[PDB]
Design a protein around this nucleic acid. Structure first.
Ligand SMILES: [Mg+2]
Ligand SMILES: [Mg+2]
Ligand SMILES: [Mg+2]
Ligand SMILES: [Mg+2]
Ligand SMILES: [Mg+2]
Ligand SMILES: [Mg+2]
Lengths: 671, 671
DNA sequence: AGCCGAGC
DNA sequence: TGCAGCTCGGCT
DNA sequence: AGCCGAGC
DNA sequence: TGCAGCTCGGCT
């Protein structure tokens, strides 16, 4: 017995014979981990150790469909390598001779995603062959080319075996991977998030399955929510926020390759995941077809996908470029960066907890994500309509209700109820034998509608005679031919119903992280707008309070610089051939202040470098007049700021954003 | 059917088969642009199929290689062609599913090579199809505009007589190698006789001699190294980027490849560029004697000859400390940097302190010519350079590979015998401690020792057992034999039997000289001599450049020190005086315009900014004393440089390189 | 019959 | 250089 | 029977 | 995220 049809398998020499139960199959996380295991086993390892690589997450066979299980290539390989059989028990020690391996050792990364792969394989064995768990079938190889040989030489220190201890292990596995335990995972994760934050005070060989689920796998389930559930403040996820942080710091004025940008994000923001997910995010942030972003913060310089296939027809990230949109810094003012709490990843400032935009971006581009226990789904909302409601709330008026709105969508979105909408396309009769379809429902892609609706109508009973296509890259135009009898019956039943041009939009899972990082469920879009409004209005007061101190410190600096230049050109003070110590002691004696900008930032010996680092040009005629004008202009800038309210500063940013939004969207219609 | 990536025409195979055209594109990216350009009307009589690069040259290929080519067999089934079948008249044109094949590639040199390979494929198997005008080309979203004006972009190949058969044979027959040399020699000659001046149907002869010849010349320019620096244009772009960025931290290879394409205008795929960076960083036995890039990661070992290198997305690299010592930064001011669309990209060549073309063994395969050089010892190269500086004759040099424990004996002119190490332990054991150069460990184990242990269908077994005790950089085989078999192996020669000796022939030392001319070199001493005269001439250029630059810097400090001394004594004042009055007074007092800028302008109003941009600190006591010391130190720096000779400057660079070479190679043995 | 490497 | 799978929750 | 997307 | 082909010339 020896496998022949599996390429990536490095089967053990003694596997399949009578020493099969003494052999261990090593399932690795990827092909890179496979090479590290083969080089670590050396020559002695290939006798009773086999290595097979897994290409990521495996199928959750618990309550999975019968067709998906039999057609899973990754699982069918594991069954053939080990020699397992469905509906067969391995309790009586006998019948263990039909197995080619006696142990399965999981070696993955020591991160959260590695723990998820362990649990999925545990769930795979537990669901099909629970009798193997009561023995010693599953084990793991933990890690902290050359270092691999030291790990396998000290395998007993890195080898941990899973142990079945009773029904509490079956409940823990069911809690994590059963579709019927969704509500239990909410309570399971609510107690974890509570106990984790309630620890403000302060801060082996075998491992039971219950301890693995409730102390190791739960770290993935929480991290899965933290990476997939967006924030209410900026509408971002931690991965999306790292991309925009990097773009803000680099400030690229030229097209930048997506793959090149993804590499820059990983370094400057400490992105600890694969480049495929990061390049996926950058493409998602740049798409602008009907159904994606209402305001794309990155430009789609290249083939980023069309509405024909819903972005699936996007080119490779190695051939497409992107850059910040002109609306990015207008939505995220640079001055507001001084109010954010930037996080640290190993003494490196990486990203803030969240950005604070001028309008709720969580409603503009429709935040959406799937985590563990909870899920989020929000539709797109009109940017101008949101700005209007913000202006109304600044004047003390009640905000108008908002319906979902998608840019360049020619259909209709009618409200059926709270968080329930009817999205309809456009279809009208041309003559007694022709109908025209000029718009599809939101996120109903053209090729999918053609193959799943029009093709069954054309072939197999049949309803239409023929149809032609006259689409562009951004519009839809179907011309369908029918008989007079068939068309008359379609009008009686409803053209939008027959041609499947109406879909329902239900949004009863508006779960987001608040400003304090707590997970909360929101019932209406108005509740999100109100909570964002109070926080953003409070931070416009922080911006003014910060700008008054900074501009005031800059005004004091220019006062000392102008005083020194005026006192020097009049002979009141001299610095020629004077020692550094005597010059500093003379400046402090004449009432000159140390660097006020530095002193103000420290508040959040004497330093006169801001005076003496000025060029000799400063003593010339034209530079004296220029310095006085800048000093007076800075003084008027502080006074003009104190007279303004936080609402005034917000309306200024809103007006500047709407002005550029009109110009950008007008150029898009022309191009 | 049975071809996934094929978008077959609707009318292909039916009664309109001879009216259909098959579009063969250069890659899948061109395929997606061809289907979108045909629109809906195009799919009736136009099929699109993508080619994955260069296709097989079926003229002198083996019969087994032709039948097992998946790319060519697909083209045959789509068109419906048959081998040996003639297509002279209408007797056999009804069995074809397509009537025309249109080649759509990039408008670059490599696109022309794919056209010729497809022309060579049809001409060799079915020459009767060429007289009917079977092959066409499509020269160059925007695709819909191209296919709408197809008549402007559609050029048809025309057969005009026996001169077309000779032109195709000249380009793709292996018996026409010497003819391609003269074919390209006349091109390079006539090309240089045109620089004194300046600057629908298409015949196959005109395609070969006016379009494909541009690739064959560019193929040599990209694959044949230069004598000066031992680099190819692709390798030189990598070193330019690394020199310009000056990375002090580990940089990802894929991230570096993207930076090279932007900063040096690399107009090819990143896969080839990432290949070069890995090749430039390898340091195992058989690769580079002095690797200019560091192998921070899995860059391949001698077990598989670098083929076991990790993905370029997971390995890092950086400049070696010997790079800037071999290529001094001061010499960059003497190079002729090229321009790619008003962007300075790279020099024609770098000028290293030693002939790098001999250190790492430059080698490359072009069209007509090929290059192959072995590695030579760096210290022996430095010693011959020191001898030639003293007017002595350089000693002969044998190939030398770093950390190679074998022997390289000269059998004749440009012919050497490379042997490993094998010795007898006892009457039943032999030990192999070294393999010949570029004989990799895993290849030697599978192709030599395994047939000796088990035997083949032809050769019998020779050894009883063998063990392995290798490291990542050393080889140790312990082989067991019988007394009879060992006696016969010693009689025939242990190095002969165990395949531990290989022949090294170097009769193709073709390189580009300093003037860009292709030249064949008969001995290594001729390469060393031509490099020596050029490098010695540029050390005179460096001194001539340093005398002017240091002299200009000395003049600058003289004016700056004079102004500060004249200001602290009251001899000149600048307070509250106009810019025009201050500049006019400096010219009146004999102050010179910026000498450093004026000197650099000579290498192609009055500027006193270098005086007045100094800080106010310059007037203090300590800064006056510091400025005077810098002025006097620069003056002594000019005199100390004038006293040195171009030979003295060279000996300083050689001594500094050998000192660091000893430290690096000592740390490598420890690490 | 296949390596070497810069290209597709 | 391009192509294939899976998780997790809500909704259809 | 499968989309949505940040992960493997 | 990793895996497969080909050119071109000299040499084994
Ligand atoms: Mg990982
Ligand atoms: Mg979206
Ligand atoms: Mg190209
Ligand atoms: Mg080499
Ligand atoms: Mg599901
Ligand atoms: Mg060949």
């Amino acid at each position: 017995s020896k496998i022949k049809g599996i390429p990536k398998l490095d089967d053990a020499n003694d596997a399949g014979g009578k020493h099969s139960l003494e052999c261990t199959l090593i399932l690795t996380e990827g092909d890179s981990a496979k090479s590290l295991a083969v080089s670590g086993l050396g020559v002695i390892g290939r006798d009773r150790y086999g290595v097979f690589p897994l290409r990521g997450k495996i199928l959750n066979v618990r309550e999975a469909s019968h067709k998906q299980i039999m057609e899973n290539a990754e699982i069918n390989n594991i069954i053939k390598i080990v020699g397992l059989q469905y509906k067969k028990s391995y309790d009586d020690a006998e019948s263990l001779k039909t197995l080619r391996y006696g142990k399965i050792m999981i070696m993955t990364d020591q991160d959260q995603d590695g723990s998820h792969i362990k649990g999925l394989l545990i769930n795979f064995i537990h669901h099909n062959w629970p009798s193997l768990l009561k023995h010693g079938f599953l084990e793991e190889f933990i890690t902290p080319a050359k270092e691999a040989k030291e790990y396998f030489a000290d395998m007993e220190r890195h080898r941990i075996l899973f142990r079945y201890a009773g029904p509490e292990d079956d409940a823990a596995i069911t809690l994590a991977f059963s579709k019927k335990k969704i509500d239990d995972r909410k309570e399971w994760l609510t107690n974890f998030m509570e106990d984790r934050r309630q620890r403000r005070l302060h801060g082996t060989k075998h491992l039971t399955y219950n301890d693995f689920i409730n102390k190791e796998l739960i770290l993935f389930s929480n991290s899965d929510n933290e990476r997939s559930i967006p924030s209410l403040v900026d509408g971002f996820k931690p991965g999306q926020r790292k991309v925009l942080f990097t773009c803000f710091k680099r400030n690229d004025k030229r097209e930048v390759k997506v793959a090149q940008l993804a590499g820059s994000v990983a370094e400057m923001s400490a992105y600890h995941h694969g480049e495929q997910a990061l390049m996926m995010t950058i493409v998602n942030l740049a798409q602008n077809f009907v159904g994606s972003n209402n305001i794309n913060l990155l430009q789609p310089i290249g083939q980023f996908g069309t509405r024909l296939h819903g972005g699936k027809d996007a080119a490779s990230p190695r051939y497409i470029f992107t850059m910040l949109s002109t609306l990015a810094r207008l939505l995220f003012p640079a001055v507001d960066d001084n109010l954010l709490k930037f996080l640290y990843d190993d003494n490196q400032r990486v990203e803030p907890e969240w950005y604070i935009p001028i309008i709720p971006m969580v409603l503009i581009n429709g935040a959406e994500g799937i985590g563990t226990g909870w899920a989020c789904k929000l539709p797109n909302y009109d940017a101008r309509e949101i700005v209007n409601n913000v202006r109304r709330m600044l004047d003390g008026l009640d905000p108008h209700p908002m319906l979902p709105n998608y840019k360049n969508f020619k259909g209709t979105i009618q409200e059926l109820g709270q968080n329930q909408y009817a999205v309809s396309g456009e279809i009208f009769v041309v003559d007694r034998n022709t109908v025209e379809i000029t718009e599809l429902p939101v996120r109903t892609w053209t090729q999918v509608y053609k193959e799943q609706v029009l093709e069954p109508m054309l072939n197999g009973p049949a309803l239409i005679s023929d149809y032609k296509e006259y689409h562009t890259d951004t519009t839809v135009k179907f011309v369908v031919k029918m008989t007079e009898e068939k068309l008359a019956q379609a009008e009686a039943a409803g053209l939008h119903k027959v041609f499947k041009l109406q879909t329902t939009l239900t949004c009863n899972s508006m779960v987001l992280f608040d400003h304090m990082g707590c997970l909360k469920k929101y019932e209406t879009v108005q509740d999100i707008l109100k909570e964002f409004f109070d926080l953003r209005l409070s931070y416009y007061g922080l911006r003014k309070e910060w700008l008054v101190g900074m501009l005031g410190a800059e005004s004091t600096k220019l006062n000392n610089q102008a005083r020194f230049i005026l006192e020097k050109i009049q002979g009141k003070i001299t610095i020629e051939n004077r020692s550094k110590k005597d010059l500093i002691q003379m400046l402090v004696q004449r009432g000159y202040e140390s660097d006020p900008v530095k002193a103000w930032k420290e508040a959040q010996g004497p330093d006169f470098n801001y005076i003496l680092n000025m060029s000799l040009w400063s003593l010339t005629k034209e530079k004296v007049e220029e310095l006085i004008k800048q000093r007076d202009a800075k003084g008027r800038e502080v006074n003009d700021l104190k007279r303004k309210s936080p609402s005034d500063l917000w309306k200024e940013d809103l007006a500047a954003f709407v002005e550029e939004l009109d110009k950008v969207e007008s150029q898009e219609r022309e191009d």
